[PDB]
Amino acid sequence: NAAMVFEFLYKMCDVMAAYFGKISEENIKNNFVLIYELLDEILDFGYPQNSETGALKTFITQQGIKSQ
Amino acid sequence: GMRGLAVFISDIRNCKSKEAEIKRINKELANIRSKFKGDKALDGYSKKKYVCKLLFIFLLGHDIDFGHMEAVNLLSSNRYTEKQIGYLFISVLVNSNSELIRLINNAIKNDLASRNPTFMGLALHCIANVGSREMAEAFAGEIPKILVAGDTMDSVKQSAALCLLRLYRTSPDLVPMGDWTSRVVHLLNDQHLGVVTAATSL
Amino acid sequence: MIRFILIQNRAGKTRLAKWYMQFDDDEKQKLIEEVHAVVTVRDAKHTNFVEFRNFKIIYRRYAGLYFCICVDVNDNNLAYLEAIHNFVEVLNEYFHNVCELDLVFNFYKVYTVVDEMFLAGEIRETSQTKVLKQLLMLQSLE
Amino acid sequence: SQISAEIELLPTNDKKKWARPPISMNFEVPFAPSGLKVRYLKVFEPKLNYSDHDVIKWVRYIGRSGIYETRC
């Protein structure tokens, strides 16, 4: 489903923005484990499971690094 | 030793975003422009410090369009370091001018009429590191006169061999083939080893 | 022949740009940027002889510096790599330690060393002791 | 700076008095006469997240002169 992939990408972008603000090289580099955990939780075998903030908070225990 | 460069580069390195660096570099450019215009800047060491600072300004990534006549004036000197800095500045910054190129050629021609390997080597490096039609025209018959079997030290021989190589690479039609081939060929059998390297390259 | 010699750093600043042929204004910057992009990606478990466009560069890592000589296609590969190592060792025995700070604060000495051991695009001198002796004899004379 | 002018006068009769017009001057100065000075200028972008220091900023002052009249 072509639109589903784009919608999932937008949801992932929103999740990353809520987690550690704007997407930058430093934020990605400092939060490798968080990104791996997020991709493991939001997506499995290609089915984009629910990405609600309340549901994702329970299944994710890693906290990103913020650099302003 | 030189004192102005240490403090100048030390200040310009530990700088903030490009705004502060641009402000500092423009302030230094204004200061050097004021120092070049008028005043009693006849001392060679002050010209050295200013030329080196300006060269670092250029190499940092900014454009330089002045301080060239006062820099080529450094060549006519007896201090080795002044000649070295002037030659380095001429090699780094190249411009197409009539009077300036003629003055540089005259300075180099005066330089080659010396009797010490250091000045001859510096002049040869200046000729070969840039390359130009004027240099080849005014020195087509001078480099082989150095490479011919005359009383010259080994270092200037290597420099002359590589300079003739560069001139042939850039001005193929301006290099003759007179009675110096019989000297360059037998130069390969000469003693020393770097001389053999330069002769083999040529 | 040698096209140019570069002494870069990890970030990308060019600590020594020495071109042996006439390039354009933006061409030099484009070449530096693409050489940095090519060199930085590779690691130790890779060949040092990486080719690009119509040339090939000979990159060799040293602490925080990426010495790079760009040679012609037909030119030998290992010889210029060892020339790079010889140049690095001459710098090491000259400054007593090679580092970015010494290159930045003594750029003209680096230029005169390069022109001493790399002139007109070929290898001017191949020895360390003789270059050091001739440079010291031409250092006390002022 | 000092300027000394000697102005020859025609004989005339009376009532001229030169009308005493004011002294007019024209100039521009690289600072604000009103004393206004820029203290800080920070640009913050939440989306692109670029550093404020990376924004090149140039501020220059040109104070033009209007009617600068001094009675004489």
Cβ separation B201–C123 shorter than 8 A: yes
Query: What are D17's two structure tokens?
Result: 């008095």
C-alpha C140/C-alpha C138 separation (Å) is 6
- CA angle A12-A18-A20, nearest 5°? 100
Tokens 């090519």 -> residue = C38
According to the 3-state scheme, what is the secondary structure of chain C? CEEEEEEEECCCCEEEEEECCCCCHHHHHHHHHHHHHHHHHCCCCCCCEEEECCEEEEEEEECCEEEEEEECCCCCCHHHHHHHHHHHHHHHHHHCCCCHHHHHHCHHHHHHHHHHHCECCECCCCCCHHHHHHHHHCCCCC
User: For residue A24, which residues of chain D lie inside 8 Å, CB to CB?
Assistant: 49
C-alpha A12/C-alpha A49 separation (Å) is 11
Q: How many CB atoms neighbour CB B172 within 10 A?
A: 9
C-alpha B133/C-alpha B167 separation (Å) is 9
Q: How many CB atoms neighbour CB C92 within 10 A?
A: 14
Q: How many CB atoms neighbour CB B72 within 10 A?
A: 19
Measured in angstroms, the resolution is 3.9
Give all strands of the β-sheet with C49-52 in edge-to-edge order: C14-19, C2-9, C65-71, C55-62, C49-52
Q: Which residues contact C131 (CB under 8 A, 6 or more apart)?
A: C90, C113, C116, C117, C125
Cβ separation D56–B18 shorter than 8 A: yes
- List the binding residues of B: 3-4, 35, 45, 49-53
Tell me, what amino acid is at C8? Answer: Q
Q: Where are the domains of chain C?
A: 1-142
Say what the alpha-carbon torsion angle C83, C85, C91, C96 is, to the nearest 10 degrees. Answer: -150
- DSSP assignments along B131-191, one per residue: --HHHHHHHTTTHHHHHSSSS--HHHHHHHHHHHHHHHHH-GGG----TTHHHHHHHTTSS
> Do the two chains A and C touch, given a threshold of 8 Å on CB pairs and at least 3 pairs?
no
Q: What residue in A sits closest to D45 (Cα-Cα)?
A: A22
C-alpha C57/C-alpha C73 separation (Å) is 10
The subunits that touch chain D, with at least 3 C-beta pairs less than 8 Å apart, are: A, B
Tokens 């010495």 -> residue = C67
Q: From chain B, which residues contact D within 8 Å (Cβ)?
A: 16-19, 22
C-alpha B44/C-alpha B42 separation (Å) is 6
C-alpha B27/C-alpha B22 separation (Å) is 8
Q: Which of B75, B66, B69, B7 is nearest to B32 (CA)?
A: B66
Distances (CA, A) of D13 to B159, C7, D6, D20, D21: 92, 89, 20, 18, 20
Query: What are C47's two structure tokens?
Result: 């060949």
* Nearest-10 crossing angle of helices C129-137, C78-95: 40
| D46 interface with A at CB cutoff 8 Å | yes
C-alpha C70/C-alpha C77 separation (Å) is 10
C-alpha C78/C-alpha B17 separation (Å) is 41
Strands A47-48 and C2-9: unpaired
Q: Which of C129, C88, C115 is nearest to B159 (CA)?
A: C115
C-alpha C14/C-alpha B198 separation (Å) is 29
The technique by which this structure was obtained is cryo-EM
Collapse the DSSP code of D12 into the 3-class scheme (helix H, G, I; strand E, B; otherwise coil) and give the result.
coil
Q: B4 and B35 in contact (C-beta within 8 Å)?
A: no
Tell me, what amino acid is at B11? Answer: D
Cβ separation D47–A22 shorter than 8 A: yes
Q: How many CB atoms neighbour CB C93 within 10 A?
A: 14
Q: What residue in A sits closest to D48 (Cα-Cα)?
A: A22
